[PDB]
């Protein structure tokens, strides 16, 4: 739309995006992962019995 001359942000290089706008060479090679909660160790030993 012309409101921005550039996009200085974490924009991944997609085929759909690359068809309309152009991208520079990557400044950050990355990928997709999963974020999960750290498992705090805690015994389930209810009692000595």
């Amino acid at each position: 739309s012309g409101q921005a001359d550039m996009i200085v942000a974490p924009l991944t290089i997609n085929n759909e995006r690359a068809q309309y706008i152009e991208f520079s060479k990557p400044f950050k090679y990355q990928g997709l992962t999963i974020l999960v909660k750290k498992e705090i160790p805690r015994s389930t030993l209810d009692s000595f019995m």
Partner: protein, 49 residues
């Protein structure tokens, strides 16, 4: 494990008189260790197992 490994690029429009010079300065900074410095000061903090 990583998937869809596509990095981050500076997006500009198709015309982009800065297209060639932007990507070279990204490549040059990669070989100059400039992005390695920015990796340390903004990303690589650790201080947690």
């Amino acid at each position: 494990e990583l998937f869809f490994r596509s990095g981050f690029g500076i997006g500009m429009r198709k015309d982009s008189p800065w297209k060639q010079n932007v990507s070279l300065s990204i490549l040059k900074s990669h070989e100059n260790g400039f992005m390695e410095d920015l990796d340390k000061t903004w990303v690589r903090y650790q201080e947690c197992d």
